[PDB]
Write an enzyme that holds these catalytic residues in place. Structure first.
Site, PDB file in Angstrom:
ATOM      1  N   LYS A 170      10.107   3.461   2.178  1.00  0.00           N
ATOM      2  CA  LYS A 170       8.980   3.366   3.058  1.00  0.00           C
ATOM      3  C   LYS A 170       9.553   4.756   4.256  1.00  0.00           C
ATOM      4  O   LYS A 170       9.746   4.353   5.380  1.00  0.00           O
ATOM      5  CB  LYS A 170       8.916   2.017   3.779  1.00  0.00           C
ATOM      6  CG  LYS A 170       8.461   0.868   2.862  1.00  0.00           C
ATOM      7  CD  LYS A 170       8.781  -0.409   3.688  1.00  0.00           C
ATOM      8  CE  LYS A 170       8.288  -1.615   2.761  1.00  0.00           C
ATOM      9  NZ  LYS A 170       6.952  -1.447   2.181  1.00  0.00           N
ATOM     10  N   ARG A 211       6.154  -8.782  -6.253  1.00  0.00           N
ATOM     11  CA  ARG A 211       5.977  -9.538  -7.552  1.00  0.00           C
ATOM     12  C   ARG A 211       6.740  -9.910  -8.636  1.00  0.00           C
ATOM     13  O   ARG A 211       6.536 -10.488  -9.270  1.00  0.00           O
ATOM     14  CB  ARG A 211       4.289  -8.826  -8.010  1.00  0.00           C
ATOM     15  CG  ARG A 211       4.962  -7.423  -8.429  1.00  0.00           C
ATOM     16  CD  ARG A 211       3.653  -6.451  -8.543  1.00  0.00           C
ATOM     17  NE  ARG A 211       3.093  -6.042  -7.193  1.00  0.00           N
ATOM     18  CZ  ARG A 211       2.181  -5.259  -6.835  1.00  0.00           C
ATOM     19  NH1 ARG A 211       1.474  -4.811  -7.973  1.00  0.00           N
ATOM     20  NH2 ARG A 211       1.868  -4.673  -5.634  1.00  0.00           N
TER      21      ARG A 211
HETATM   22  C1  LIG Z   1       2.803  -0.239  -4.405  1.00  0.00           C
HETATM   23  C2  LIG Z   1       1.727  -1.392  -3.841  1.00  0.00           C
HETATM   24  C3  LIG Z   1       0.942  -1.823  -5.131  1.00  0.00           C
HETATM   25  C4  LIG Z   1       2.308  -2.599  -3.267  1.00  0.00           C
HETATM   26  C5  LIG Z   1       3.126  -2.281  -1.959  1.00  0.00           C
HETATM   27  N1  LIG Z   1       3.676  -3.565  -1.610  1.00  0.00           N
HETATM   28  C6  LIG Z   1       4.743  -3.282  -0.746  1.00  0.00           C
HETATM   29  O1  LIG Z   1       4.896  -2.444  -0.037  1.00  0.00           O
HETATM   30  C7  LIG Z   1       5.180  -4.832  -0.185  1.00  0.00           C
HETATM   31  O2  LIG Z   1       6.294  -5.097  -0.694  1.00  0.00           O
HETATM   32  C8  LIG Z   1       5.270  -4.911   1.426  1.00  0.00           C
HETATM   33  N2  LIG Z   1       6.048  -5.778   1.819  1.00  0.00           N
HETATM   34  C9  LIG Z   1       3.843  -5.226   1.893  1.00  0.00           C
HETATM   35  C10 LIG Z   1       3.130  -4.887   3.066  1.00  0.00           C
HETATM   36  C11 LIG Z   1       3.125  -3.386   3.332  1.00  0.00           C
HETATM   37  C12 LIG Z   1       2.785  -3.063   4.648  1.00  0.00           C
HETATM   38  C13 LIG Z   1       2.601  -3.695   5.618  1.00  0.00           C
HETATM   39  C14 LIG Z   1       2.846  -5.328   5.400  1.00  0.00           C
HETATM   40  C15 LIG Z   1       3.219  -5.584   4.213  1.00  0.00           C
HETATM   41  C16 LIG Z   1       2.190  -1.859  -0.842  1.00  0.00           C
HETATM   42  O3  LIG Z   1       2.183  -0.761  -0.288  1.00  0.00           O
HETATM   43  O4  LIG Z   1       1.291  -2.594  -0.327  1.00  0.00           O
HETATM   44 MG   LIG Z   2       7.885  -3.697  -1.041  1.00  0.00          MG
END
Ligand SMILES: CC(C)C[C@H](NC(=O)[C@@H](O)[C@H](N)Cc1ccccc1)C(=O)O
Ligand SMILES: [Mg+2]
Ligand SMILES: CC(C)C[C@H](NC(=O)[C@@H](O)[C@H](N)Cc1ccccc1)C(=O)O
Ligand SMILES: CC(C)C[C@H](NC(=O)[C@@H](O)[C@H](N)Cc1ccccc1)C(=O)O
Ligand SMILES: [Mg+2]
Ligand SMILES: [Mg+2]
Ligand SMILES: [Zn+2]
Ligand SMILES: [Zn+2]
Ligand SMILES: [Zn+2]
Lengths: 518, 516, 518
Positions: B299, B376
């Protein structure tokens, strides 16, 4: 009226094809219990196998030809399966000793096809029509379909088969020939017969919107698009009026006019009306966003992913509404009066453009602080909604390519609907079902309203803090309907078929079924 | 308990938890408003609106038992103030006995039905006064109309917002009240909401404590230790599955995520069983990522909020918060399994990589397209585990997709599912808990984007930007023949403005279990 | 007075300006604390602190001429409250005449000299007590030590924060009544009385600047802003000249003219003069950056964080200079002549705009290679500084929202001052101290000069290597002052109050104290 030009080579109208090759196809429907005559052209069976994933093909119709019946025996068909969208061609001589082509498209193993499944079937059928010079197609339904799905089949076949060559010059397809006859065999034929010319009407409304959308911004600008609308109205005998800048200034449409300030094309507000002869029981205003090119303005679409090259499609709303006018004007429903409205303009960069931060006054007296010139659709819609409500209608429905966030919420298959009235929303959902144009109801979350509070103006155009932009845009629009049932259909994600590189003409059949059902 | 590994001796080895809070010491009394108000003691606040007259004047109708306060509350004085939502005034004065009291009001606007958002603003305004007060009693006089669920919500929200989490600090402006009086019409019907509110408050606050706990305190080992201790205090059955058991169960998706972490994976399984015949079995599954760095898909992009990613076990915290409520309220005829595949998603020589093909416990091979889609993967194996329990419903809750912020935003969670009846039960729980949720579609047309060239399935889509829907399509592959729903709380879990968790989902899930 | 050009008839043709504000109707009475406080209608607030003891108890020390109120405010009752900075409480009681009175206090903490920032916090607390409470009177009792300048700052700040700008409200006016009377109790009152009208003048100059800054770019463009300056000069009897493009071409102001080329509004150069009736002993030019909207030009502000939506604020230097003109013209200092200058224009994207790379000639004949059209402020200031030095003044001081880098260096609280003359910089720093508008001295680092060497022109507008953009800007401006004491105040970081979503009118009081104390 007159389209301004920068150089003499700039076009001064949208090319529009009315008499398309689909219109020359003679369509006949026959009952399947009489058996199928196989005489010429191509004959395609639509076959499934319920329960059996990738099950075998078994042709159940009576075929009135010994040679073809022999060919289609189960033993000979057993090598083939019904996997959805699968197809095969067969070649043989019939009883009259004339060669014929026969085949099938697999419709899978789930006995009720979704709209997307049916589209897959139609696309496979269309690939059999392309690159094969045939004068006749015959389709035999060995699957179960209700009247609306049968109509959807034909509409979809007509629209996918039609190829838009208006902007081809040295590269027209020298081999495209269209069939002149369509035979259809189906159980209980007489009840399906009514659907044929309704499909043809719906195909044209959809294809007309498509032509307008695909027409690029140098052909399709506020002047040529409103001129096309007048020509449409004249052809259908609709009442029409186009409001120019001076009338718009008189109406105090400051939000719409600010958007079009930086353009070389004057603002044109389209107002067409259908009125049934007889008692008018419902009055409806349909409002389509009609930005003929959305550059973003001083908040230029320059960020990666902003799709500036697609922005000729930002009048898809207006096109859906005009497609709807074509269908309503053609089918002539009773008991209604419909106003087809679009505030048309182009959002450009100029010394003359509105700026981020500008405070503008809408036709209902609300002052608006502009936080982003790229949120222009809601400003034009604001004044159009005020105009619609003054007409004294029962329902106002707007349709608009409003927010890019739709791609992240519903994606490319379903439109979002928002509204201030649950019965109207349900009507739209109902129309979504019978038109087979999918829509999902999304909320107008009032908790976010406070983020539109402006320090200086009555309201902010955009939220400072909320990223749920489709909901925020609906909250903003809601401020311009005072006391009328209103729904807003955001088609930003569904309007353009990114894979096929063409418009869908999304919303024409939805809005028409809405008018017809009411 | 397992021992929590440390890098240095200064590294914490448990999550500090407050069970006994000042809220627990508040004696609450509910009185009928028809009898008039006793204002002899403490801080009295009227909740007042003015229907029609937008930002109109305050007018107080209740008779009160003190001549000084009666004078303060006369129409001529009160009309100097207005009802705009959240606006408040309060004044200290001496009552008839020359004892110090304070009297004020919170504006409730001019719409008779308050939404949960509106009720939150009223409560926040009340809490601001409380954080600056010191009087022993608060009395709240409802000159507005609320239903039983909204009255409970008022209380829960009051308790939750009033309580301040000081576990990590090393006011002389306030003292916690010892007494809460409430005047409201039909007081008798409302009385039973009080202890229910106090339970829902602590379930929510407990979840909050776990979420706010930073990732050096709350890691897979200390979090599963905390769940064991909770289970022990509630007399729930509990089992923590460690790495060897998880390998035996073939949980390759879940184990892959935690490969990069210094903390071994821990799968939490608590069970509540009713003493009478079980008529309904439910599995509640929570996403339990104690820190989500993204992994090798780090991130690092603007707006990715890595500083917030201790909150990625919010779904697990909501499930544990629910287990407190259920374990306390003791519903009849139900068996509920509280599940979380807990781990940490880190960057290491040992981490899984983008591109890896891993095998879930149901035999499905999954091609990893993005190591930051780790939630997931852990839910896939948790879902296969849940279904093997033979339950009637599986509900999962997870901070799964950033896209939620762009679809529903920070107020409403989304629910997806494979069963309409179950989705409607969730929607109904959402209404009675006042934790808002909206139904979103699982669109089958997007399923083809998950077809891997090499593995049985892709973890993510290359093409589709509707990531919350794609995630749901992916998870649906891990439930074969049970009613299942998925609640994505990514947008709704953290209160950005207030810099603290919501504890979102506790009340929603508890209502689900209690009323179904 | 020129005509403001319009694109549509709904475009505004003047900036709305409120001169007679509700603050001007407030009657201020100052009393000495030795006579005791009378406590009657309205609200009476004591400002109390507790030196040493962080969050120590409230103790009211003033004599109150009322037995009931004195009993209420006795130590025993007050000690349950503390003095935490910004904390406040309201009290209700009946006085000796049986009339209910409201009393209260604001905490001023435990540090015996309040900073400008602390005092602002006290005032903001006081204002929250004024809001949403229909009061005819406010009385403030000082039980804290303030010098005369800090007392004045208290009043200026109170007036400024209390005043709500509703010029752009239409449907959303706050259904907001102001006090008619302000009583102040302070020790040695006679010595503070002279600060009252001075505070009222400084409030208005600040609020006047604020009105200009908050006015959006469609209202406040170069024509309407120079018309407002004309109107202000006419009201104050200042001399004025507005130079239009023909006169600017004659003066060879190529740098300033180039910036404005893209705008639909003609450049207007503002020149106001105040001269004292006596013997002039000092001549001063005050130069303000006057960009009514900064889009960036072809170097468009499209980068994340470029804040294009705030760029109506780019004439904040000009506003501060006109706010100063208001104060000077009102207070009428002796022995001085002051020139108030601004090269006003708008920086836009157009077929007509100047381009990255253009080489343009300033009025002192220096050629300048344009490296980034978004460094337009220093080009307009180049020409304004040449004009200013030609006037034959002792000091030139410019004030400008010049570089975003100020946010990274001093931030949102302190402005930066650069200059070529230490005696003049020290005067500005002294004015900062007595105005309570904070400024910090920053260096013009000669080592960076070489990075402004142009291969083709006499000088580069921007550095290609040095990221210290505020110092680089100062180096560039220095080249346009040959032989006169000059200072430059960069207010990019300090002008806009981001949290409160409004201007500060920063610089007005600073520049006025500079003029007065000279
Ligand atoms: C690559 C994508 C399909 C999924 C990806 N999911 C994630 O990063 C999750 O693991 C995150 N924990 C979801 C999230 C992102 C920003 C703020 C709150 C919560 C996302 O960026 O939403
Ligand atoms: Mg994530
Ligand atoms: C500035 C924003 C809050 C609003 C903005 N809206 C728009 O740009 C509309 O005018 C766009 N025409 C909507 C759009 C964007 C991308 C793809 C399809 C459709 C958007 O980015 O969605
Ligand atoms: C090209 C750069 C060397 C100079 C450039 N300067 C400008 O853009 C000025 O014209 C801007 N008015 C500076 C600005 C930006 C953001 C907030 C406040 C002030 C800047 O980025 O500061
Ligand atoms: Mg746009
Ligand atoms: Mg600039
Ligand atoms: Zn648009
Ligand atoms: Zn995660
Ligand atoms: Zn600038």
């Amino acid at each position: 009226s007159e389209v301004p030009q920068v150089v003499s080579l700039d076009p001064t109208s949208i090319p529009i094809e009315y008499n398309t090759p689909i219109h020359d196809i003679k369509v006949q429907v026959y009952d399947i219990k009489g058996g199928c005559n196989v005489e010429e052209g191509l004959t395609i069976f639509l076959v499934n196998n319920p329960g059996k994933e990738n099950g075998p093909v078994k042709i159940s119709s009576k075929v009135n030809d010994k040679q073809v019946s022999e060919f289609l025996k189960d033993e000979n068909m057993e090598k083939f399966n019904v996997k959805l969208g699968t197809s095969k061609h067969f070649y043989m001589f019939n009883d009259n000793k004339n060669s014929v082509a026969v085949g099938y498209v697999g419709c899978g193993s789930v006995a009720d096809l979704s709209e997307a499944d049916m589209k897959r079937v139609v696309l496979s059928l269309v690939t059999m029509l392309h690159d094969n010079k045939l004068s006749k197609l015959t389709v035999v339904f060995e699957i179960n379909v209700d009247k609306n799905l049968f109509r959807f089949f034909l509409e979809t076949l007509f629209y996918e088969y039609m190829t838009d060559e208006r902007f081809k010059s040295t590269d027209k397809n020298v081999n495209m020939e269209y069939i002149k006859h369509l035979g259809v065999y189906i159980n209980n034929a007489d009840t399906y017969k009514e659907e044929v010319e309704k499909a043809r009407v719906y195909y044209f409304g959809t294809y007309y919107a498509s032509q307008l959308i695909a027409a690029p911004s140098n052909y399709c600008n506020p002047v040529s698009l409103s001129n096309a609308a007048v020509e449409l109205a004249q052809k259908l005998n609709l009442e029409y009026k186009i409001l120019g800048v001076k009338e718009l200034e008189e109406l105090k449409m400051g939000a719409y006019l600010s958007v079009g300030k930086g353009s070389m094309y004057p603002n044109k507000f389209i107002h067409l009306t259908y009125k049934s002869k007889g008692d008018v029981k419902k009055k409806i205003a349909l409002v389509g966003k009609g930005i003929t090119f959305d550059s973003g303005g001083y908040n230029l679409k320059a960020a990666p992913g902003s799709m500036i090259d697609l922005m000729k499609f930002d009048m898809s709303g207006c096109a859906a509404v005009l497609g709807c006018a074509y269908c309503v004007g053609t089918l002539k429903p009773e008991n209604v009066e419909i106003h087809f409205l679009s505030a048309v303009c182009e959002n450009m960069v100029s010394k003359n453009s509105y700026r981020p931060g500008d405070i503008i006054t809408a036709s209902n007296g609300k002052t608006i602080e502009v936080g982003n010139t790229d949120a222009e659709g809601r400003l034009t819609l604001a004044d159009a909604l005020v105009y619609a409500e003054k007409l004294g209608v029962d329902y106002i429905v707007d349709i608009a390519t409003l927010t890019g966030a739709m791609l992240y919420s519903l994606g490319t298959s379903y439109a979002g609907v928002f509204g201030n009235n649950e019965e109207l929303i349900n009507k739209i959902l109902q129309s979504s079902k019978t038109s087979n144009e999918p829509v999902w109801w999304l909320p107008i979350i009032n908790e976010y309203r406070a983020t539109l509070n402006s320090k200086y103006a009555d309201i902010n155009q955009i939220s400072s803090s909320v990223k749920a932009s489709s909901i925020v845009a609906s909250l903003f629009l809601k401020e311009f309907v005072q006391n009328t049932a209103w729904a807003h259909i955001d088609i930003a994600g569904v309007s353009w078929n990114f894979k096929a590189r063409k418009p869908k003409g999304f919303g024409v059949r939805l809005l028409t079924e809405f008018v017809l059902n009411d």
